[PDB]
Design a protein around this nucleic acid. Structure first.
Ligand SMILES: [Mg+2]
Ligand SMILES: [Mg+2]
Ligand SMILES: [Mg+2]
Ligand SMILES: [Mg+2]
Ligand SMILES: [Mg+2]
Ligand SMILES: [Mg+2]
Ligand SMILES: [Mg+2]
Ligand SMILES: [Mg+2]
Ligand SMILES: [Mg+2]
Ligand SMILES: [Mg+2]
Ligand SMILES: [Mg+2]
Ligand SMILES: [Mg+2]
Ligand SMILES: [Mg+2]
Ligand SMILES: [Mg+2]
Ligand SMILES: [Mg+2]
Ligand SMILES: [Mg+2]
Ligand SMILES: [Mg+2]
Ligand SMILES: [Mg+2]
Ligand SMILES: [Mg+2]
Ligand SMILES: [Mg+2]
Ligand SMILES: [Mg+2]
Ligand SMILES: [Mg+2]
Ligand SMILES: [Mg+2]
Ligand SMILES: [Mg+2]
Ligand SMILES: [Mg+2]
Ligand SMILES: [Mg+2]
Ligand SMILES: [Mg+2]
Ligand SMILES: [Mg+2]
Ligand SMILES: [Mg+2]
Ligand SMILES: [Mg+2]
Ligand SMILES: [Mg+2]
Ligand SMILES: [Mg+2]
Ligand SMILES: [Mg+2]
Ligand SMILES: [Mg+2]
Ligand SMILES: [Mg+2]
Ligand SMILES: [Mg+2]
Ligand SMILES: [Mg+2]
Ligand SMILES: [Mg+2]
Ligand SMILES: [Mg+2]
Ligand SMILES: [Mg+2]
Ligand SMILES: [Mg+2]
Ligand SMILES: [Mg+2]
Ligand SMILES: [Mg+2]
Ligand SMILES: [Mg+2]
Ligand SMILES: [Mg+2]
Ligand SMILES: [Mg+2]
Ligand SMILES: [Mg+2]
Ligand SMILES: [Mg+2]
Ligand SMILES: [Mg+2]
Lengths: 83, 99, 104
RNA sequence: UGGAGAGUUUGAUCCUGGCUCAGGGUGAACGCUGGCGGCGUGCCUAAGACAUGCAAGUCGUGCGGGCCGCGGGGUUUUACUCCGUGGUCAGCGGCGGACGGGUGAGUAACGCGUGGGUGACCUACCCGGAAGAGGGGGACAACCCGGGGAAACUCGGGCUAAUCCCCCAUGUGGACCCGCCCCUUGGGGUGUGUCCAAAGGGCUUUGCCCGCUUCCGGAUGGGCCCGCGUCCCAUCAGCUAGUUGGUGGGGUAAUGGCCCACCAAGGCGACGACGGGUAGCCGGUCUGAGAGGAUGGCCGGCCACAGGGGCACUGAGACACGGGCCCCACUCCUACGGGAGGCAGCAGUUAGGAAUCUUCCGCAAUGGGCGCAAGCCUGACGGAGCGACGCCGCUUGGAGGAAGAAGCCCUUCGGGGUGUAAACUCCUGAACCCGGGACGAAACCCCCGACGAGGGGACUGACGGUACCGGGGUAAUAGCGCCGGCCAACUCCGUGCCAGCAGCCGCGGUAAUACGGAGGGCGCGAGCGUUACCCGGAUUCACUGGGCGUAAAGGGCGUGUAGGCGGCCUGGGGCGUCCCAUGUGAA
């Protein structure tokens, strides 16, 4: 199935991830279906997480499955906040 | 040495037999039905035709034929059987065939 | 869009099939001038309907054989053996180009 | 935000023309030299051969067991026998092993690029919707009993569970024949007939969780087809017999000579067929003013390959690198019968070579497989290690300091040079020492809420006692090339067409700024030179952007085939050409 997961993009000791949609079977850094966010785990800037809940919600609706820290990040942007 | 891809192997040899058998049963039944129609033996020819239609759809149940491969086989068969009783049949036991 | 080409039937010699000759101008990548250039398609003709010289639109289509992947869609201009003749001489020439000559 | 030229044919000249330099680039290697760090990068050759270790498994919440323990029962006691529980092992079964990872050998091909087509198709796991699980039956491992082989391993007999196999039923629905309607290639309806379903498991047990069945849709991935693009040789000119097309079969998820039988005699080529050579293709890279040229190495995408050659099984998917069979070549075992292998996974060894790294740490992060979960596996990966191999940052000190030591070097014998350089005065304080010491990590999980949204909690760091912060604190490596012109920089001695230099032009035949050394000078600087290769200057294959009376170049002349090209006026079409919109042009 298609996943929502992290793609490692920074540099040696400088991790930045792209939050991506992709078939589970790509390499982690290979061709992805759509970037739908980014994550800087060092919080080196004020702007260290970013999602696009609209698209995130889209891919969930067609059954993308997010990895365990992708969903954590998605939640942190209120992808799932329903109230 | 040793894996249990080893297991995967011997499991396959099992399936290789299950499939082979199921499929033999069809070929040999389908032929039998076709030949009963070349003889215009309509009631009996359909009685076999319907059993073979079954063993086919039954094959497709699990991973032997599956699909539209059974549909292929079914069609190919039901064609020849109707077309071979064009030779003065009148489908008697009238099973397999739409009026 | 299934591709549609327009051409000249230059062969009836087959059962349910016509050779169709299709030209295409275009400017030459480096040297500019407009170059003609052509290619023969084998097309599906199930009524053996179209005849030597007819100008037909030919359409992309699901394979009929090796070679045959087009069907003759409609008839544009009926009859004109100049094109056929033009094409015909071109292959007449071929005979010359070899290892001998004279009356050959 | 874009274009520099020079040296060399002559006694001199102008032109033609080649050769050479200056510039940029590099997975480099070689020489002399070598201090720190960050980030990259590192078998170009043998797709040669490979020791050793590790590299794909997981699930007891599908099933039944063996072995080793412990505990509770039925009896008055033993014997026998029943139940519970701990460890362990494989077996049956499910999912994964078709991904990830390696390489570029082959391949000039729908292989790749790009844009389309599929009324000619498939898609496990995932999401949405509709509906369903009622009866019954069977076998094979495990285990038990025997045989055979040295071994790898193998044969026979008996028992048994299941989410293993089958039969009947239910038919939402679907498949197939025939018909009918709408569509229009095999798209979507509809009727009769026929055919086709299912599996159980766990509980904080009646109602939840995880599964199972059929169908319809989505999503992702893929098959196949087509237009167009894709190197050199014509001293390769003709090629083809499944060849080209038809009919009907076979085969497949599906179109197709894909394969087969029969029939017709086609198909292809100078717009380069057939043959030979070479090569993985692209995103991109380098160069260039551009147009071009060159290239495909890191990373990303496609393809192909897994000692060489075939092949099919299983399966959603493979004709499968760590699966199966056969043939070939090697190496190993061998009781001579027969067996065991396959680093182009990570390291590592050897061989070839001018040359290419550690048998390192860790699953903490990201990602993948299985598992309800706990977790397990992961040489993917995250790091560390080696090499100046590249890039970038940084140090070997700063301020003062003579009319100006000493040595060395010139000298017109007065002087001049190295040279504020050193010595020396003061100042700072790379190295080193002490102390604190990270970010990367918040989820899974547990509690509350409702296993939702939301809130609370706990656990977790290979790198690493590193980064960085603070306190101490020492004047602490300089090399290499060049100095005739092109080309920045000249003097002495030695040498005598020798020894030697030399990119090109040319130096050396006793007063050499060209050889060798010295002093000095120029250029770069932890580097500087050399070789090799690429583009450039090279308008020196000229499209941009050249030529042919005598420099190289008009065919000995014609004829006229293909082809190229084509006077003036009107009209239609709108192929070329131009315009707008739009889609594509991933990272
Ligand atoms: Mg298993
Ligand atoms: Mg001369
Ligand atoms: Mg001269
Ligand atoms: Mg001159
Ligand atoms: Mg390094
Ligand atoms: Mg190599
Ligand atoms: Mg391990
Ligand atoms: Mg046990
Ligand atoms: Mg087990
Ligand atoms: Mg070739
Ligand atoms: Mg294409
Ligand atoms: Mg569903
Ligand atoms: Mg038995
Ligand atoms: Mg079953
Ligand atoms: Mg039934
Ligand atoms: Mg090659
Ligand atoms: Mg140029
Ligand atoms: Mg090898
Ligand atoms: Mg092979
Ligand atoms: Mg499967
Ligand atoms: Mg199969
Ligand atoms: Mg495999
Ligand atoms: Mg393969
Ligand atoms: Mg291997
Ligand atoms: Mg290795
Ligand atoms: Mg050697
Ligand atoms: Mg390394
Ligand atoms: Mg993980
Ligand atoms: Mg790594
Ligand atoms: Mg934190
Ligand atoms: Mg954990
Ligand atoms: Mg000078
Ligand atoms: Mg002298
Ligand atoms: Mg000298
Ligand atoms: Mg010189
Ligand atoms: Mg530096
Ligand atoms: Mg040029
Ligand atoms: Mg030249
Ligand atoms: Mg020109
Ligand atoms: Mg010229
Ligand atoms: Mg002359
Ligand atoms: Mg001449
Ligand atoms: Mg003349
Ligand atoms: Mg002449
Ligand atoms: Mg003419
Ligand atoms: Mg004109
Ligand atoms: Mg003309
Ligand atoms: Mg037009
Ligand atoms: Mg555009």
């Amino acid at each position: 199935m298609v996943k929502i997961r992290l793609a490692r993009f920074g540099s040696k000791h400088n991790p930045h991830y792209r939050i991506v949609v992709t078939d589970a079977r790509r390499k982690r850094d290979g061709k992805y279906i759509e970037k739908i966010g980014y994550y800087d785990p060092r919080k080196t800037t004020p702007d260290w997480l970013k999602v696009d809940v609209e698209r995130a919600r889209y891919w969930l609706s067609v059954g993308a499955q997010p990895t365990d820290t992708a969903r954590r990040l998605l939640r942190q942007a209120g992808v799932f906040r329903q109230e | 040495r040793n894996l249990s891809a080893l297991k995967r192997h011997r499991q396959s040899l099992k399936r290789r037999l299950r499939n082979k058998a199921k499929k033999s049963a069809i070929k040999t039944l389908s032929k039998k039905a076709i030949q009963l129609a070349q003889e215009g033996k309509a009631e009996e020819a359909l009685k076999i035709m319907r059993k073979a239609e079954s063993l086919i759809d039954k094959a497709a149940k699990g991973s032997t034929l599956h699909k539209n491969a059974a549909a292929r086989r079914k069609s190919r068969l039901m064609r020849k059987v109707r077309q071979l009783l064009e030779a003065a049949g009148a489908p008697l036991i009238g099973g397999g065939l739409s009026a | 869009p299934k591709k549609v080409l327009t051409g000249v039937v230059v062969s009836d010699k087959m059962q349910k099939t016509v050779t169709v000759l299709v030209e295409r101008q275009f400017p030459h990548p480096l040297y500019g001038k407009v170059i003609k250039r052509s290619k023969k398609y084998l097309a599906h003709d199930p009524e053996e309907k179209y005849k030597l010289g007819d100008v037909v639109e030919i359409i992309e289509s699901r394979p009929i054989s090796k070679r045959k992947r087009f069907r003759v869609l409609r008839l544009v201009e009926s009859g004109r053996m100049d094109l056929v003749e033009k094409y015909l001489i071109r292959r007449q020439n071929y005979e010359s180009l070899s290892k001998r000559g004279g009356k050959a």
